[PDB]
Structure 1
Amino acid sequence: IVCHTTATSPISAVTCPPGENLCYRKMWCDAFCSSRGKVVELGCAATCPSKKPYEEVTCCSTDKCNPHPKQRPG
């Protein structure tokens, strides 16, 4: 499948290398840790890379299901 890259490029669903059997949604806090909370460095990953502490990672297998919740006027 494909996954969006928020860490690398700007944000585009581009197939990943051999390993990521799905996508994911990482979270932490930009270098500015704005009031927007954490970030959304989605992408590809073998499996829910979710950590435990902050490293709040997710998953996404659907076609471009890495479109974190942000695309909205607010």
Structure 2
Amino acid sequence: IVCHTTATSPISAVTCPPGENLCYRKMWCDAFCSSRGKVVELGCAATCPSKKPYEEVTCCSTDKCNPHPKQRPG
């Protein structure tokens, strides 16, 4: 499948090779939950782990399913 990544200058999406089928989007308020806040991360994965709200990651089993929450649609 294809997931969104943020491990570069601009955010893009690639096709995970024989290893990952799910995508992930990390979120956690950086010392600015008011202004900056929830830092947004991106990447592909095979499983879907869980953690405390302080550091959570949304995992999906679809394509382009892990985009920025504030990404301008359209």
**Structure with bigger gyration radius:** 2
- Unaligned residue ranges in structure 1 (runs of 5+): none
Count of residues in Structure 1 that have an aligned counterpart in Structure 2: 74
Matched residues, percent identical? 100
Alpha-carbon distance change, 31 to 73 in structure 1, aligned in 2, over 3 angstroms: farther
1: CA distance, partners of 2:46 / 2:8: 18
Unmatched runs of 5 consecutive residues or more in structure 2: none
Q: Deviations along 1:3-49, whole A, 9 cap, x unmatched?
A: 11124442111123443221011112458767132122121011223
Stretch moving more, 8-17 or 20-29? 8-17
TM-score, L = length of structure 1: 0.69
Q: Which has the higher strand share?
A: 2
Alpha-carbon distance in 1 for matches of 2:69, 2:10: 15
Q: Which has the higher helix share?
A: 2
TM-score by length of 2: 0.69
CA contact (8 A) 2:19 2:46 kept: yes
Distance 1:47-1:36 versus aligned 2 partners, 3 A rule: same
* RMSD of aligned Cα (Å): 3.1
